[PDB]
């Protein structure tokens, strides 16, 4: 996953989880990427799927 096209003002709500470096399971790519942005680039992807 690439978060350059972010941030986005809205995200669809399908669930396909990603595991962030904060140990938080992000519900989908759009959610994860907006988090990355909000973290000012500090949050990374730990791995695909639930944490």
């Amino acid at each position: 996953v690439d978060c350059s096209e972010y941030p986005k003002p809205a995200c669809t709500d399908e669930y396909r989880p990603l595991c962030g470096s904060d140990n938080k399971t992000y519900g989908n790519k759009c959610n994860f990427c907006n988090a990355v942005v909000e973290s000012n680039g500090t949050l990374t992807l730990s791995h695909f799927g639930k944490c």
């Binding site: 096209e5 986005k8 003002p9 809205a10 995200c11 669809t12 709500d13 399908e14 669930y15 396909r16 989880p17 992000y26 519900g27 989908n28 759009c30 959610n31 907006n34």
Partner: protein, 185 residues
């Protein structure tokens, strides 16, 4: 199975919006973004119980899809969880509504605006959406928005979350019913 319950496709989990029928043929509505590129749908993560296969999908522009049931024994309740649904109606500003989804359960709020355009990016723009102050989270897509016994919309997406609050957009259900020639029951 009923409105708000989880549905799984080969790609992920969404929520069942409303059970609908045309003549003797049963289907279920859900989000078009969830029907897009999905063929078969199951009732569990294990994919052991089949529900049916995609029959239509409209996303972006609109956000609705319909799946035809192939599962003969599964109960197809005309409700949202325990709630009966008896008709469909148009959203109005100020309307008190309730959403049910597979991740967050039931949450209430109000219609704050109509005919909203939501831009999901990459060319995924949907139009004519109902804006509300109800939250929703990943997995909640395609769940029902209703008011009392009235079916009003399908969860499409938005921002924020249920802890801290958010804005969610729904596709008007009436349009979907009209397009597929089906009705709630």
């Amino acid at each position: 199975i009923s409105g708000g319950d989880a549905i799984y496709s080969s790609t992920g989990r969404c929520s069942l919006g409303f059970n609908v029928r045309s003549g003797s043929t049963y289907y279920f509505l859900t989000a078009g973004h969830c029907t897009d590129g999905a063929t078969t749908w199951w009732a569990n993560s294990a994919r052991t119980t089949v529900l049916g296969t995609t029959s239509g999908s409209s996303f972006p522009n609109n956000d609705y899809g319909i799946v035809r049931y192939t599962n003969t024994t599964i109960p197809k309740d005309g409700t949202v969880g325990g709630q009966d649904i008896t008709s469909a109606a148009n959203a109005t500003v100020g309307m008190a509504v309730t959403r049910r989804g597979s991740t967050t359960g039931t949450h209430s709020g109000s219609v704050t605006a109509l005919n909203a355009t939501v831009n999901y990016g990459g060319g995924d723009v949907v139009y004519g959406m109902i804006r509300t102050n109800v939250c929703a989270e990943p997995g909640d897509s395609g769940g029902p928005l209703y008011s009392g016994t009235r079916a009003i919309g399908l969860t499409s997406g938005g921002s924020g979350n249920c802890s801290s609050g958010g804005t969610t957009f729904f596709q008007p259900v009436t349009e979907a019913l009209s397009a597929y020639g089906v009705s709630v029951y």
